[PDB]
Amino acid sequence: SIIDQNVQALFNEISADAVFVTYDGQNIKKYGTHLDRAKTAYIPASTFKIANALIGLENHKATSTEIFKWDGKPRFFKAWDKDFTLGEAMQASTVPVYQELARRIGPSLMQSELQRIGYGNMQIGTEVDQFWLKGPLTITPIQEVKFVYDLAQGQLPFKPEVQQQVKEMLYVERRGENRLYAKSGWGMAVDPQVGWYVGFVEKADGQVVAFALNMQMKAGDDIALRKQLSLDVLDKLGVFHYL
Numbered sequence: 001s002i003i004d005q006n007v008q009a010l011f012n013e014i015s016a017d018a019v020f021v022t023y024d025g026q027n028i029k030k031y032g033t034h035l036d037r038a039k040t041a042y043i044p045a046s047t048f049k050i051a052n053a054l055i056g057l058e059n060h061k062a063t064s065t066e067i068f069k070w071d072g073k074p075r076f077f078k079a080w081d082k083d084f085t086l087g088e089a090m091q092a093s094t095v096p097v098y099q100e101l102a103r104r105i106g107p108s109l110m111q112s113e114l115q116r117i118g119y120g121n122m123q124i125g126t127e128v129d130q131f132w133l134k135g136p137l138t139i140t141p142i143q144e145v146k147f148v149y150d151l152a153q154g155q156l157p158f159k160p161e162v163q164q165q166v167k168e169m170l171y172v173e174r175r176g177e178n179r180l181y182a183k184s185g186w187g188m189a190v191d192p193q194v195g196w197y198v199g200f201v202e203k204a205d206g207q208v209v210a211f212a213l214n215m216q217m218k219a220g221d222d223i224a225l226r227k228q229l230s231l232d233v234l235d236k237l238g239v240f241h242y243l
Helices: 002-010 035-039 045-058 086-092 095-117 141-153 160-169 225-236
Strands: 018-023 028-032 171-175 178-187 193-202 208-217
Touching: 002 028, 002 225, 018 035, 018 141, 018 225, 028 035, 035 141, 035 208, 045 086, 045 095, 045 141, 045 160, 045 178, 045 193, 086 095, 086 160, 141 160, 141 193, 141 208, 160 171, 178 225, 193 225, 208 225
Parallel strands: none
Antiparallel strands: 018 028, 018 208, 171 178, 178 193, 193 208
């Protein structure tokens, strides 16, 4: 199919090894320069914020209204120097706010909850606020698409309210009545570095196509590429067309 060929042509100048997995509730479809990446486990990085938010709200450790106050000490980026709700922090990818959520959840509950939902290898180690940034928690792009697909359909083992709230924290944009929900991740603290753009497209008629861009990153790469590349792929597949 020429559609599949058009998609592979996007990965021509992408020197980095990469895979784009799609899931529609039935079929898994793999695109990119290195398809084995789809069944290979990598640290989740900021994509873990989806599970971290679900676990926190489910176990009454935070609300989607609750404001995480900035004490005034300058953070790693200027953009994080303000107060945040979990939804604001999801879009801004405010690591410290979600590190505080993880500290409130604690090692025991986080450990049992990841085992209960079956998230990746389910291993957290001793550092409760560093396991998604440095390991030992890893997850495959195939596991990522299935997890966000269930989130989109409300089928994850969490309360309907909890999933709906976290779902709208991922909302990026709409085109007609086609809605894009997504989360970026750049695992900088490991070799080889991993780049994520995970999410789903919810069509007007109720259909869902969950996706996962997974590629190798290196210091100095363009931060905007993961999203841009994911939007180009989604356009070439006819899943989320440009206006």
